[PDB]
Design a protein around this nucleic acid. Structure first.
Ligand SMILES: Nc1nc2c(ncn2[C@@H]2O[C@H](COP(=O)(O)OP(=O)(O)O)[C@@H](O)[C@H]2O)c(=O)[nH]1
Ligand SMILES: [Mg+2]
Ligand SMILES: [Mg+2]
Ligand SMILES: [Mg+2]
Ligand SMILES: [Mg+2]
Ligand SMILES: [Mg+2]
Ligand SMILES: [Mg+2]
Ligand SMILES: [Mg+2]
Ligand SMILES: [Mg+2]
Ligand SMILES: [Mg+2]
Ligand SMILES: [Mg+2]
Ligand SMILES: [Mg+2]
Ligand SMILES: [Mg+2]
Ligand SMILES: [Mg+2]
Ligand SMILES: [Mg+2]
Ligand SMILES: [Mg+2]
Ligand SMILES: [Mg+2]
Ligand SMILES: [Mg+2]
Ligand SMILES: [Mg+2]
Ligand SMILES: [Mg+2]
Ligand SMILES: [Mg+2]
Ligand SMILES: [Mg+2]
Ligand SMILES: [Mg+2]
Ligand SMILES: [Mg+2]
Ligand SMILES: [Mg+2]
Ligand SMILES: [Mg+2]
Ligand SMILES: [Mg+2]
Ligand SMILES: [Mg+2]
Ligand SMILES: [Mg+2]
Ligand SMILES: [Mg+2]
Ligand SMILES: [Mg+2]
Ligand SMILES: [Mg+2]
Ligand SMILES: [Mg+2]
Ligand SMILES: [Mg+2]
Ligand SMILES: [Mg+2]
Ligand SMILES: [Mg+2]
Lengths: 131, 60, 100
RNA sequence: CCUCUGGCAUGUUGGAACAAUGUAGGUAAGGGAAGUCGGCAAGCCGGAUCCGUAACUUCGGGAUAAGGAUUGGCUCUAAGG
RNA sequence: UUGUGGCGGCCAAGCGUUCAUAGCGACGUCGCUUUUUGAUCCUUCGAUGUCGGCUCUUCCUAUCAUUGUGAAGCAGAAUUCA
RNA sequence: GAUGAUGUGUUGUUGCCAUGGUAAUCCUGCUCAGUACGAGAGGAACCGCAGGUUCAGACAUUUGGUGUAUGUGCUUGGCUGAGGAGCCAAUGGGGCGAAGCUACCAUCUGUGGGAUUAUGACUGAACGCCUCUAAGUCAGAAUCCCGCCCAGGCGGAACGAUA
RNA sequence: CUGCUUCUGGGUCGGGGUUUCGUACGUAGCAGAGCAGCUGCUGCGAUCUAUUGAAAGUCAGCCCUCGACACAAGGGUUUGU
RNA sequence: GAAACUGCGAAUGGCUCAUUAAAUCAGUUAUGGUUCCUUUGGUCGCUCGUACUUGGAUAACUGUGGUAAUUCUAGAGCUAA
RNA sequence: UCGCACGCCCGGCGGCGACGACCCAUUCGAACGUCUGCCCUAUCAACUUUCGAUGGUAGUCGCCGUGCCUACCAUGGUGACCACGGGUGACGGGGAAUCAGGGUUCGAUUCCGGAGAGGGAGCCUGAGAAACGGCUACCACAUCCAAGGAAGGCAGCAGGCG
């Protein structure tokens, strides 16, 4: 019901982030974000909770050379929650997620922020600790 | 939030429930097993000083 | 509002201020300001830095019904030794019957 | 780079301001060439000591290949005539 | 100037299971445009700086989307024509 | 963009609006609703609600940048006999940094009317009936114009003080 | 855009408030790897502990002062219905 | 005599043969280089300094419960070795 | 500390036991030690070392001996008699098949020893465990859920997929 508030985005096109799930993929190179119109000379950027499109740059052989939709899990750009805290994470992170929301993985390493765990309810169930 | 009150001087007990917090910050931000005065609780609670002795969380 | 405490220094973080850090292993660390944040990410012990709180606590600067129970309880000991005497009236006569 | 002997008055003018645009220095969160014809420019590495060093080859090289660790101050000890 | 390029009409053989014209449209035919290339050489040879890209404003409509609408071989969803 | 000019007797305060400019945009999620429609498969809308993209205007509490308060510590080479206190090295270097600037990299805000276009209709002839049109009449829109907002005319007004 | 004698006003200095950095010099210490000179003592010794959230800066465009100190009834040029 | 505290067992047994090439394992000797519940047999007034029975907790149990859920257990109250 | 029969001196002596114990035996052993013994490969000929390799001294630790570890010294140890490395579709052995005499092949398999409970690691109690029909982590897999959490380990007997 309640939609997702605006948080500061700090992952433009061309960022490799940690593929933190149990597929075997270890990188996610962001190729484009889903939902971005953008203006002239504007990199489509993503933040926490923004389901994105990525390519695995390092990992298993059968997960590379192919575009996977993904979902950003952690960023280290300090985004602002509405209750007044500037949270940020240690590293950037993401899991591999099909178009319906369900993960290709089965487990998620480390924390998932609440801004993604509320928006993607099946990433939240595989999450060890939230925010 | 339920409160299991107990009289150890003869050894009986029963359970009450209250659902407002300006009656309940007399308990909050303490340790376990400190002495708090229950005189800020209500109409029948005058002269009663009490031990909070710990209890179960929302998940038990 | 929850008025939390800074992880490096240990002052009292108010709701608008501060900054929140979350590592890859849980461990959500609060910070009052970037003076504390830089000194935490540089991995500095607070116990060696003179302005915090964990320094100053280290260096110690600053500062049968009850009626019957009570009825037998309050009983006077000459009545008790007389009761001991009719216990003797049982026992020594019974032991004369033991040998007899 | 700093100083002593020696030399000089800032290189054909001064004063008051610290706007734009420059020229010359710098610094930047998150991302890291997505900019652009092109990593242009900037940046990264950098000395020394102890390790370690591949393919290839005219056997000489490559080679400081690459990749690591240490480096301050103070107090000693040992060895070198 | 408009061959050529682009765009749009008219007439109706036929396509559209049926049915010319929902959407198309043969043979023919009438036009518009200067975002193509030709044609000409009037202007410029006592020099109007000759490709692209970046930046930036403004304009056209021959509309891709958005607002309101009319039409379908429009049930809804999608999509075509206006 | 910045002074200023004419006269209004000179000056000052408070204003008016002639005129120019003009601005907001599009989308997603909840609900409607697995409902209308449909054999199914699928599958919307109107009013509401919560947010977002692009845009415009700001602003500094908070977060981030900057940082020569050359503010405070640490520190290399040298120099003042040494300490202390300091200086030079075209800002020596590096932490941390107040104020001020500043960032969708933080935060706030972004409007209402009128005649109408296309179109759908009303009464109603032409043309006994019919007809949205001929006379008359209604609804009508990201358009147009005005509002809101920016500037304020060789354009005015009210009011004070007038050596 | 402001201020410039109602015993009032601004201005300088001082004081507090705020804040930044991080605990001053001196002194003391049977704290200090150790070393040296005298027979347990005295000197050298980076650093540490106490004094000490100390010291230092803080409006030049920060906040209150009612403490001190002087200043402030002026100068010049034009304007008439 | 249910329940519960205490003692004991749960390191045997059963399965499989992944690892391991002087390792395992096999014959051989050593432990004068070590431990060893148990079972049996020795020692068990050898010491020269309230004992007619010393103490206070705890379980079962009564009672009040919490958790969505576990062979989760919380506060209270009695009581033995 | 506990139980059964119960007597004798004029309160004190007493019976049969049961349990529990320091230490020495004994038993079940375990544990490192000594000698000798194993398939294939040289398209593995030098390996081992300040990252203990082989020794000496003194300690730590252990239940003990021991470079097992630490400090200081010595420069050693193994190898053409195959060291070292690699392979094993290799647990070793008692044994099994075939067989004149020799052999060659097999031995996961019920007896003995060892190793291991998905893979490594670490520990509690206990005399005995680096136990897994114990616990704690991480890795891999995987069950319930109100999304806050919980619990698990068939190479034990059946049984299921693969
Ligand atoms: N409003 C309403 N809906 C109903 C009723 N009974 C069934 N439904 C709805 O019918 C829909 C389809 O029903 P379902 O049993 O799933 O379909 P089925 O299995 O083919 O019968 C569901 O969304 C139900 O909620 C009713 O009595 N009233
Ligand atoms: Mg571009
Ligand atoms: Mg100069
Ligand atoms: Mg000069
Ligand atoms: Mg940067
Ligand atoms: Mg950075
Ligand atoms: Mg490009
Ligand atoms: Mg490019
Ligand atoms: Mg270059
Ligand atoms: Mg090279
Ligand atoms: Mg036909
Ligand atoms: Mg010509
Ligand atoms: Mg020109
Ligand atoms: Mg048109
Ligand atoms: Mg206007
Ligand atoms: Mg249905
Ligand atoms: Mg139906
Ligand atoms: Mg700020
Ligand atoms: Mg800063
Ligand atoms: Mg700042
Ligand atoms: Mg000095
Ligand atoms: Mg120079
Ligand atoms: Mg900085
Ligand atoms: Mg209207
Ligand atoms: Mg009309
Ligand atoms: Mg109308
Ligand atoms: Mg093997
Ligand atoms: Mg094997
Ligand atoms: Mg065997
Ligand atoms: Mg086998
Ligand atoms: Mg085992
Ligand atoms: Mg298994
Ligand atoms: Mg185990
Ligand atoms: Mg089992
Ligand atoms: Mg077992
Ligand atoms: Mg069996």
């Amino acid at each position: 019901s309640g939609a997702k508030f605006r948080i500061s985005l700090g992952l433009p096109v061309g960022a490799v982030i940690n593929c933190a799930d149990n597929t075997g993929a270890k990188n996610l190179y962001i190729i484009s974000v889903k939902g971005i119109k953008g203006r002239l000379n504007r990199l489509p950027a993503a933040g926490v909770g923004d389901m994105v499109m990525a390519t695995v740059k390092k990992g298993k052989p059968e997960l590379r050379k192919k575009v996977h939709p993904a979902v950003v899990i952690r960023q280290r750009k300090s985004y602002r929650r509405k209750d007044g805290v500037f949270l940020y994470f240690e590293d950037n992170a993401g899991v591999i997620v099909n178009n319906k929301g369900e993960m290709k993985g089965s487990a998620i390493t480390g924390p998932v922020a609440k801004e993604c765990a509320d928006l993607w309810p099946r990433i939240a169930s595989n999450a060890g600790s939230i925010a | 939030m339920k409160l299991n009150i107990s009289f150890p001087a003869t050894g009986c007990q029963k359970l009450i429930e209250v659902d407002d917090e300006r009656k309940l910050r007399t308990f909050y931000e303490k340790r376990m097993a400190t002495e708090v005065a229950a005189d800020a609780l209500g109409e029948e609670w005058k002269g009663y000083v009490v031990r909070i002795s710990g209890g179960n969380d929302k998940q038990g | 509002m929850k008025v939390e405490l800074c992880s490096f220094s240990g002052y009292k973080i108010y709701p608008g201020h501060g900054r929140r850090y979350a590592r890859t292993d849980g461990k959500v660390f609060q910070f009052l300001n970037a003076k504390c944040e830089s000194a935490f990410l540089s991995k500095r012990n607070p116990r060696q830095i003179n302005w915090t709180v964990l320094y100053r606590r280290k260096h110690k600067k600053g500062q049968a019904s009850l009626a019957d129970i009570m009825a037998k309880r309050n009983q006077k000991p000459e009545v008790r030794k007389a009761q001991r005497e009719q216990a003797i009236r049982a026992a020594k006569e019974a032991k004369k019957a033991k040998q007899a």
